Amino acid sequence: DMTQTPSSKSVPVGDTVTINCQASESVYSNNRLSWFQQKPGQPPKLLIYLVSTLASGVPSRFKGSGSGTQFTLTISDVVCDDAATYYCVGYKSSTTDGLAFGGGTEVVVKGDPVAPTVLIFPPAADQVATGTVTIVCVANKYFPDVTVTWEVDGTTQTTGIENSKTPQNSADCTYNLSSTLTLTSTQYNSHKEYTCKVTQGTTSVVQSFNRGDC
Amino acid sequence: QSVEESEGGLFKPTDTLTLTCTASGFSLSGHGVIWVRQAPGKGLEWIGSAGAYGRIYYASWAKSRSTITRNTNLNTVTLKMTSLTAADTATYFCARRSDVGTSVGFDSWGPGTLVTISSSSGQPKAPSVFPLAPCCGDTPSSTVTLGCLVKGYLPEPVTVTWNSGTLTNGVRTFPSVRQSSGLYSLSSVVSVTSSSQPVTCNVAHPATNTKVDKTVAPSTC
Amino acid sequence: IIXGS
């Protein structure tokens, strides 16, 4: 196995981040170790092989080292484009369970904080006849990460919610998010006020509509 | 010089999952080829490998119900998995390794192929497309964000364009989500001037030979 | 064990 710590890390733009990888036993020749970068929605990309050798096109602010069973990836002068999950892969032999993937370290790159602008979209008129309605809430261009709460006539919802997040913007580190609340048609017709609350720690942005007005 | 995974799609628990790693512009022969997957919200998971010189080796969880086969006549490496379960719903990737000396320097990756294992009662399902428009607001604005909600389709993917692909500025199409029903949904929004002509989302779902266009307008007010 | 060698 390859044990990766931490599982997540936040690093300000311009700073240096380190990712740790402990092999449960020596890898072959103590050097069969690669690092990969994977951004959501993309395949993994090779960064470093044989502990410290850069893959083509990879800039030298990515650095790999190793000693015994311990391997480290260092990314200096971090930019928003570095937001990704990083994996080490170790190899011992061409046998059952002879190589292993680390669990990954998600690197979040910290740009300037900015509160989302929030949009809410009442269900189109043809939704309710189907027996369920889906309300959509969009949070635009925000950092850091948010948590989303839905309220119906003041009651917090605990089921029927899905969230989808775009990856950190390679230019300004911000996210975008789509949150949906799905209710049965009788639930929707039995209530009036629908509220999406998008929270960043001590900051919240709230957007509502009242069913009778749309 | 690239690899690509063959079409995934919707599979029953009694089906066989067969995925082909195809090469274009180079040979897989004499090069390592790996199969890996990523379940939603999980890390990359190794399935097994075709060694450069003919050995096939597996993760122990996969070995009891998987076969990886090289075909040096057709220039492919194939993954076959049986006894499918919901845990096998995932994106599947293959990759080629340029140099045996790196052992795991896998440098040529496929784009990934989407696989969903349903229950027995899983047939493909076309998306429903609903317009997204704001409520009537007391201060109308010089710009407005409109959109389309693409709801209840199976399997992935759908593709969304606006105005037959001519409208790209201000478009944001979010990653899909999978609702409690097991069906997939996504949202696509676009910001436009309140004076411009109506915008149309084009939603294609190849798995059901379906395309749906919805022309979206600001609400009457 | 080691890629054919």
Side-chain angles (χ1 to χ4, degrees), chain A, chain B residues 2-221, chain C:
Chain A
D1 299 10
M2 315 297 290
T3 297
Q4 260 184 264
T5 59
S7 53
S8 182
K9 247 171 178 178
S10 294
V11 56
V13 172
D15 283 5
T16 292
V17 63
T18 66
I19 298 173
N20 311 114
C21 174
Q22 179 183 351
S24 62
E25 63 185 77
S26 64
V27 302
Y28 179 75
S29 196
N30 297 121
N31 69 7
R32 298 310 204 267
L33 190 289
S34 289
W35 291 95
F36 298 84
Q37 179 190 67
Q38 189 184 25
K39 300 185 183 183
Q42 299 182 15
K45 173 184 182 184
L46 183 67
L47 292 176
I48 289 171
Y49 55 91
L50 294 169
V51 180
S52 56
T53 303
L54 293 166
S56 293
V58 181
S60 57
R61 57 197 186 80
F62 293 88
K63 174 182 173 65
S65 64
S67 189
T69 56
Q70 195 65 32
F71 304 91
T72 310
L73 176 67
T74 305
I75 311 170
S76 62
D77 295 314
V78 166
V79 294
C80 292
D81 192 51
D82 297 334
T85 296
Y86 292 84
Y87 296 88
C88 63
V89 178
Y91 169 97
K92 186 58 157 280
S93 60
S94 300
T95 60
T96 305
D97 293 332
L99 65 84
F101 280 62
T105 298
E106 179 179 14
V107 170
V108 180
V109 182
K110 295 207 269 179
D112 277 347
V114 54
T117 59
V118 177
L119 306 163
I120 194 163
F121 296 99
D126 52 328
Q127 286 208 43
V128 69
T130 73
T132 64
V133 302
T134 296
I135 309 172
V136 181
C137 181
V138 174
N140 286 305
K141 195 172 144 176
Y142 65 86
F143 188 84
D145 275 296
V146 300
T147 63
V148 179
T149 285
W150 284 89
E151 296 177 5
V152 176
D153 287 337
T155 300
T156 297
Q157 302 300 285
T158 61
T159 189
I161 297 166
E162 306 293 332
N163 295 302
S164 175
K165 182 176 75 176
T166 62
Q168 287 194 263
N169 184 266
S170 55
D172 66 14
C173 277
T174 59
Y175 300 100
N176 307 275
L177 181 131
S178 170
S179 183
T180 59
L181 171 68
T182 298
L183 304 166
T184 70
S185 291
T186 174
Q187 289 171 313
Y188 182 66
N189 288 339
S190 300
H191 296 278
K192 283 227 154 47
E193 188 186 59
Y194 294 87
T195 301
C196 172
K197 175 173 181 180
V198 182
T199 298
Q200 290 167 318
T202 60
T203 303
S204 294
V205 178
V206 182
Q207 185 56 50
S208 297
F209 73 91
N210 190 280
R211 174 178 50 76
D213 299 355
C214 327
Chain B
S2 63
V3 298
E4 178 176 357
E5 308 82 3
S6 64
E7 175 177 0
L10 184 63
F11 297 80
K12 308 182 179 180
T14 54
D15 284 337
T16 295
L17 172 62
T18 302
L19 298 177
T20 304
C21 191
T22 63
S24 166
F26 56 15
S27 181
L28 303 182
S29 307
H31 293 80
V33 176
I34 193 166
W35 278 105
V36 309
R37 67 182 186 180
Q38 184 167 45
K42 283 197 170 72
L44 293 168
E45 183 179 39
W46 178 53
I47 305 163
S49 296
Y53 294 119
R55 188 165 293 278
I56 308 291
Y57 52 111
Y58 303 87
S60 51
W61 68 264
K63 190 178 188 298
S64 56
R65 59 184 186 103
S66 307
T67 301
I68 291 171
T69 302
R70 189 180 282 285
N71 185 334
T72 55
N73 178 58
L74 301 182
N75 191 29
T76 63
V77 174
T78 299
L79 166 70
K80 176 177 176 288
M81 298 179 64
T82 58
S83 297
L84 306 177
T85 76
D88 299 319
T89 292
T91 300
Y92 287 73
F93 299 97
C94 69
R96 184 194 184 262
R97 181 189 62 215
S98 283
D99 200 312
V100 62
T102 69
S103 295
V104 284
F106 279 91
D107 53 333
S108 298
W109 286 81
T113 187
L114 301 171
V115 170
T116 301
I117 308 315
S118 70
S119 63
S120 63
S121 69
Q123 231 193 336
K125 191 175 177 290
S128 299
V129 184
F130 298 107
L132 296 175
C135 195
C136 289
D138 192 14
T139 312
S141 183
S142 71
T143 64
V144 62
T145 297
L146 307 170
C148 287
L149 169 64
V150 184
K151 178 173 179 171
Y153 59 96
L154 185 72
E156 295 199 85
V158 297
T159 61
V160 182
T161 63
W162 288 88
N163 290 348
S164 304
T166 68
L167 179 54
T168 61
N169 291 326
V171 173
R172 300 215 70 97
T173 298
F174 291 83
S176 69
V177 300
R178 196 179 182 198
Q179 296 284 138
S180 314
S181 60
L183 303 177
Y184 292 91
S185 292
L186 64 70
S187 301
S188 182
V189 299
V190 57
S191 297
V192 304
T193 307
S194 61
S195 65
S196 55
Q197 43 231 13
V199 292
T200 299
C201 66
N202 324 109
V203 179
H205 188 232
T208 58
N209 297 297
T210 305
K211 189 177 76 70
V212 179
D213 287 1
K214 290 293 174 166
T215 300
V216 187
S219 184
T220 181
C221 33
Chain C
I1 243 147
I2 303 307
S5 301

